[PDB]
Design a protein around this ligand. Structure first.
Ligand SMILES: Nc1nc2c(ncn2[C@@H]2O[C@H](COP(=O)(O)OP(=O)(O)OP(=O)(O)O)[C@@H](O)[C@H]2O)c(=O)[nH]1
Ligand SMILES: Nc1nc2c(ncn2[C@@H]2O[C@H](COP(=O)(O)OP(=O)(O)OP(=O)(O)O)[C@@H](O)[C@H]2O)c(=O)[nH]1
Ligand SMILES: [Mg+2]
Ligand SMILES: [Mg+2]
Lengths: 171, 171
DNA sequence: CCT
């Protein structure tokens, strides 16, 4: 296995294109109440599936819920694309304010893996250009994550490595 | 600053071309007895500064000293180039054997910075082709370090980032 | 400088 160490109080930020397997991974490794996804926060704002007209409100709600869980000292996982620096920065600042380590888990998979998974999804699908763009953004982001303020940066480079991951939580 | 977290029980493996500043960095951040350098181990095998033939024995000696220190529960830093996967593999095995975390600290500096520091050092220089080779080997190594078994991988991407490092040791 |  590939062991990824995280502090008992962490903010775990998943970073990956649509189709990279972020939500699948979060379900496998974390309790449901530890995981706050952008899709869930959109669903609070709208009774339409994956409503694109409420994006800003949904991310405001995600930041708020994340902050209040960290205030209570509860480990939290942010399940969103997080491929833009502008997306990650508030999460780093929130972790700081609550004396929490921010941890990056990056799904560094080839674009084709994500494009192929996308076409077979039974929940929702995105257009090909979205995944092309996310993948470019993700790859561009890797080098500067430590400098951005992530205390541990874990990069997963294939489905096989993702599959092998085990988390070790430290008190 | 850039905070690098390491457990009190760590094997810290410095990875970098000749000239990248490994020994200077080790001296700034760790106690002298914590640092085992390949240069010191060659010196135990020969007073001939340029006796090429002692390299294999010197690394056997280095590995054994590291083993015994980790067995004693003493944090140890390996001060050698560590740019070949074959050099890192036995160090990872040692850390595992004594239930210690192997940590990678990578001096990802441009070849030119290393070449210039080599030209200007007054202690012991290497030939230009050596630094060209080391830098190529170092860059090729970065992606695979986590999969080799390093539990924390810290990449320093400029002299500015190297100077900003502070270690936080956690027990 | 793991030649
Ligand atoms: N074979 C295999 N398929 C996977 C794996 N992980 C995810 N998938 C499939 O890939 C598709 C996308 O997975 P998700 O976890 O929803 O991807 P995501 O990164 O959350 O995507 P977004 O929510 O759009 O950002 C789903 O149909 C998954 O079942 C995996 O580890 N192995
Ligand atoms: N300006 C500046 N010079 C440095 C720094 N670190 C090292 N140097 C200089 O670079 C030269 C080599 O530094 P070392 O620490 O000996 O490099 P090394 O990586 O141990 O080299 P090898 O033992 O040959 O593998 C010395 O002359 C240092 O004074 C630094 O952080 N800033
Ligand atoms: Mg998802
Ligand atoms: Mg040195």
């Amino acid at each position: 296995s590939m062991k990824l160490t995280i502090p008992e109080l962490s903010l775990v930020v998943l970073i990956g294109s649509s189709g990279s397997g972020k939500s699948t991974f979060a379900k496998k490794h974390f309790k449901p109440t530890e995981v706050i996804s952008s899709d869930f926060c959109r669903g609070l704002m709208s009774d339409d599936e994956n409503d694109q007209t409420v994006t800003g409100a949904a991310f405001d709600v995600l930041h708020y819920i994340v902050s209040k869980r960290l205030q209570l000292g509860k480990l939290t996982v942010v399940d969103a694309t997080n491929v833009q620096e502008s997306a990650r920065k508030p999460l780093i600042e929130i972790a700081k304010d609550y004396h929490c380590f921010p941890v990056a888990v990056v799904f560094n998979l080839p674009e084709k893996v994500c494009q192929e998974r996308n076409k077979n999804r039974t929940d929702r699908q995105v257009e090909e250009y979205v995944i092309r763009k996310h993948t470019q953004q993700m790859k561009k982001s890797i080098k500067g994550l430590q400098r951005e303020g992530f205390r541990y940066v874990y990069i997963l480079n294939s489905p096989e490595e993702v599959e092998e991951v085990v988390f070790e939580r430290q008190p």
